[PDB]
């Protein structure tokens, strides 16, 4: 007999906990989708109350339940009491709901399926009206959040002023990039940041010139995972957008005199930065954790950088539970995970729907970028503390550099 | 019998605790890991609500095991409230994650061990099946100068943790190609040489460098023949190639971590500076996949910090060859950050993909009686 | 226990009875490889003696086993008697060995093996440690070296001369390499399609029959009886082969097959055109033909086509061998080429092994010149040796 | 229960005291024709023995026993001595081998004949099939001219007794050759010829003959489409052929048993001179193999002493046809007296068998218009 | 037609089609000719009339 009486009793408590609980419960219940008449009386008149008024709590609903003269038809109020117990987080009231939700269709298919049974033995008599009330029976089950202008428009509103409300104290690690710095604020403790763009735009050096910005002017230490590029060559990029040294002609060396002399103002300064990097060729996530795990508490850990989350293995021998775990760990360690991301070629401006068929990366990040005249483009698709817009940068090729605009 | 209860229920009760302690727990265990019946079951429903959805916690875990079915097969809920009001913190589990998983192992040792001693009674049968399969079943110029001025423009030249593969079709001449290199380096630099011949013995690989060394027609020695000023020649050869510092394994088809496990000796025990494997679909996987090969040779490249020269060989498409032959026998194309081919008895270095400098073409002279690569 | 008590005897009395038999055990076994301590110390003490001195029969042995007082501590000289006038035969003796040697090295792994187990219980601990010193138990190139060894080879084609130890090919640079095919060698010779490996396995059996005094048995799985004498009666007396194949022929073209005939039938040349044979059909027919008349040469077109016991290649290869070694005779097996050619090499019959190993003498084929590379052989230089090949006669002559 | 316990104590002893007399067992005996269970395991691990290897004792044969842990299963050791000092002489053993063999060969026939019954009784229901798998289970210009001068020469031509095999590849012809034969012997000689055509139908095949016979375009029939006087050429080629002695069955898949009974009742009727079957893969067994109805064609040609022509299609092997790609669906090999071969409209046919008389390539031209062959 | 039989048998008649003039390839017919009779066809009408 198909019930959830566990996760009943959640929605019902956690009602009484929030009770700004009980509007997402009713958009997915209603009393009988609860199988203990116990129950289905009291969600009703916890939703009879609501309909006032008053609001809603354990005074209100032992109120209406004596009013309909059904409280010690419940249990006792101590019941009501009870109930506030046995649910874990209110916050997760939608998923208990759901889980009611589903027992209470089964329930209903079971039934009208039994009376179909049931109908094959005293009708015989029909057949044609049996195997059409056969259809309409089940039918009538795959029928038992639609989304309305009155909001889109607020957001759509309060958003097109955070781009210009901005001002601008940084709350989280400072990129470097004034113009990204008032958007995001920047990038903060706990948070994990997705950097997505097609091969050849410049997310690597993107990811390494806030990466180096970091350590180089701030305190904090920044931990570099490169999957692709090794640990020589990654240095090789950030001397030359240091100390502003041709690329190409470090590359075919080649070296000005006094280019030369630019090359050991970059390194001293770079030497005093705290980069770390690991250039495993594929690392599972749990050794990026362990190896951020100690060395946050033996010498201090500000940011991660992850070049390119498509080239971490799994736990086998999926890419949703590397993202999910990249978020654990960001809040873990309370530091921003900054994890680049490739985009998939319906490019060819990118949109989330271009790594949504890569996903489930959408959802564990709080915050996700696209990179799209030697300008660049930096759209913020996503953000949840903070405007949605575009800012831009100017990437200069000879350096491998994003500078100011 | 390896086990540990308490840190069993710890990891479960640690779940139901935070429970964003399931990522890390999913991250080391497995429900089979666990040594309890009982323990197995709910940590797989605990996983599998984990793949939705919706998340993880004492309602939604205990509506996982009525729905299969096996909720009474544990304790009641009883004792899953047990497992909750056990442990007192969930910082820890990983942990105990990392405990329940060593008694898992271990059972996994006693297993596949004890398994042998039982097979060393039904057969007898076998031996060298049973030798064999007892490993299987316990197993569970700002680089290197190539010498082509030309090539080491482009290249600067071999660079340490670089995985290089060379391209070619059959008979165009990656093999001498290699070799040219790997000689080059061993005479001319004071480096070591790894050579990896899984095609050509060793004495017939030794035989081509003789010839390339001190400039011995090849088909001299092969049929031999052999003229007395020419066998002169090959006495200031084998001279000058004694002190060169080439280890050459001319093992029939290796696994990839056995070409680690040797390089690794030999860079702590004389020091390493190149590894040269000649063709990869000859190497076989950890089986009884060429791209966990591949992957496995960039991670071996970085481990070691030396340029590590792999052979390939080209699909029938190119009958100019492009990224596209060997990309329908990827996914070598990504881990290598340099991707050179093959292609007047002149051959052209076509380096279609290096990461830190140019692409183009390098055009070398090659001598079919000495089995050389010269200058142009 | 793993075990061969019968076995050991063996080894034990086989000395007693040559014993030039006790260098070939003991390269073979060591005394801990006997079961029966008593075992043990007997071939032990056989072993002390063959380190004067002095030399090593029942007297010697009885002194030194009485030496360190294990006389009594066997059975008595009544057992060292047994030992021998046990086990009748001692040509074996090596043997025997493997088999004492093969049940030792089982008795180890399920020590070593019970150890691995027994020690998952103590520990707990180190783990990374012991699944480390797993291995180790469960596990029981230099270029100095290689020129040294070339240079034996370089030569090894300058060297030869010149005695030609083995049965002659009728090809004199081949025999200068070889020596040419020698008793218990199996010798394969490896091909593409119409290279013309088939003409060349004949031409060796003919020149062999004809010139010397020696029997040659042919299995023809491709090709019939007939059509393979026709082949050979060309490349004997000189007849243009699509002369016959169309017939047509010069009336002294005609003359010229009589003398082919004649020459022809003295050999000793027996065929079997039986299209695809088992292994043992091929052995207990070659065994029969030596006692009988006397054996020297067996060649088989094409090992492909040998099925198997059932209704395993290298099962075939491995009985091949087999047969080489008991008649002591030079099995020449013609092998096919996979399409990795298309200058062969060792590989181009590695992924249709084991080949490699069971061959002591691996040969492939390669201007109406042909090559004949020989990319392995156990006594002997590794190289090419160089052959012509006349379509019109379907021959291969010297150069 | 046929069979020699005391004969085949011998062979077993025999080989232990020779122990060359192995070879002469090996050669007349398998281990299944030894009747005692323990025997076979003797035999058959002193069999095992002797591939490696190694060679053959006393001592050997029971490590090979206890290898197989099949020792202790027999007698003991105590067994193989008894087998030993049982038999005084181990010349005779060969014997001793015939003798088991014989009390091997009754228990079979016994045995196929006590399967025959049996079946008789479950199936009710087959018949026409139950009276096959009852043969083929207990199955365990001197000749006729054919027409082609040269082909004559070699052959001498087709002769009575004798199974012919002419196989060939899809589309070279085998069918039109088959066929101009058969037109050949029926109109130029007074005999007659029983066609099988399995493939294809009666009249599909009198149309091709027809065209062949008098000259018609075959395309023209197919299309239809005549000249006036083509159309008189037909009634020229009707009356002669139809004073021919053609007898064609066009049933789709017969059995060898249907084809033997029907040419039997033909020849003690009218009179039979050759039996020609389109191809052989086609003919079903006696179930509901290949080797059987091969064996069962011979006979056919025996018993009624004609020259049976079956033609057979060869394997994708040769994309010149040899003797090995027909062997990889034998064994036709052996039970043909003669096998052919077809491979410029001009077409080859290999001799590569022949019983009595040379082996060569005779050379005929193929029209396709007429679907004839004709000599050059 | 083959490689989405087995029509071929079953059909005692097939046809194919293939200057606004189509072709009608008669390809297979059990008691008549094997041949290509030809129409012409008419887009604005969407219809073949003789030649």
């Known amino acids: 007999?198909?019930?959830?009486?566990?996760?009943?009793?959640?929605?019902?408590?956690?009602?009484?906990?929030?009770?700004?609980?009980?509007?997402?419960?009713?958009?997915?219940?209603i009393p009988e989708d609860?199988?203990?008449?116990?129950?289905?009386?009291?969600?009703?008149?916890?939703?009879?109350?609501?309909?006032?008024?008053?609001?809603?709590?354990?005074?209100?609903?032992?109120?209406?339940?004596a009013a309909s003269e059904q409280l010690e038809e419940i249990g006792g109020v101590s019941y009501l009491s009870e109930l506030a117990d046995a649910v874990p987080t209110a916050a997760n009231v939608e998923?208990?709901?759901?889980?009611?939700?589903?027992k209470s269709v089964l329930r209903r298919?079971?039934?009208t399926a039994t009376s179909i049974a049931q109908d094959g033995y005293t009708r015989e008599d029909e057949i044609d009206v049996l195997l059409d009330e056969a259809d309409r029976k089940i039918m009538e089950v795959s029928q038992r959040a639609f989304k309305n202008i009155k909001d889109i428009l607020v957001q759509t509103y309060d958003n097109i002023e955070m781009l210009h409300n901005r001002d601008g104290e940084i709350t989280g690690i400072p990129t470097g990039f004034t113009e990204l710095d008032r958007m995001?604020?920047?990038?903060?403790?706990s948070d994990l940041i997705i950097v997505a763009a097609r091969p050849s735009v410049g997310k690597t050096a993107f990811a390494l010139n806030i990466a180096q910005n970091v350590a180089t002017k701030t305190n904090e230490n920044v931990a570099i995972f490169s999957l692709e590029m090794s640990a020589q060559q990654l240095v090789m990029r950030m001397l030359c957008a240091e100390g502003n040294i041709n690329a190409q002609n470090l590359r075919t060396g080649k070296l000005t005199p006094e280019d030369w002399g630019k090359l050991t103002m970059a390194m001293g300064s770079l030497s005093n930065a705290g980069i770390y990097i690991d250039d495993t060729p594929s690392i599972r996530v749990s050794d990026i954790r362990a190896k951020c795990r100690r060395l946050k508490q033996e010498s201090?850990?500000?940011?991660?950088?992850?070049?390119?989350?498509?080239?971490?293995?799994?736990?086998?021998?999926?890419?949703?539970?590397?993202?999910?775990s990249l978020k654990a760990l960001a809040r873990e360690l309370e530091v921003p995970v900054i994890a680049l991301s490739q985009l998939s070629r319906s490019v060819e401006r990118p949109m989330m729907s271009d790594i949504r068929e890569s996903g489930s990366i959408e959802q564990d990040a709080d915050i996700v970028?696209?990179?799209?005249?030697?300008?660049?483009?930096?759209?913020?698709?996503?953000?949840?503390?903070?405007?949605?817009?575009?800012?831009?940068?100017?990437?200069?090729?000879?350096?491998?550099k994003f500078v100011n605009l």
């Open 369 to 400: 970028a696209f990179l799209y005249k030697n300008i660049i483009e930096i759209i913020i698709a996503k953000q949840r503390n903070g405007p949605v817009g575009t800012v831009q940068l100017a990437f200069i090729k000879e350096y491998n």
């Open 95 to 102: 998923y208990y709901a759901r889980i009611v939700e589903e």
């Open 184 to 189: 995001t604020s920047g990038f903060q403790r």
């Open 300 to 324: 201090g850990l500000g940011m991660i950088v992850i070049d390119y989350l498509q080239l971490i293995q799994g736990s086998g021998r999926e890419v949703s539970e590397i993202s999910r």
């Open 1 to 29: 007999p198909p019930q959830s009486i566990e996760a009943e009793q959640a929605v019902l408590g956690a009602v009484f906990l929030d009770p700004a609980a009980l509007v997402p419960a009713s958009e997915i219940l």
């Open 109 to 111: 298919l079971i039934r």
């Open 34 to 65: 609860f199988y203990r008449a116990a129950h289905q009386k009291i969600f009703h008149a916890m939703l009879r109350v609501a309909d006032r008024g008053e609001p809603v709590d354990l005074v209100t609903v032992t109120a209406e339940l």
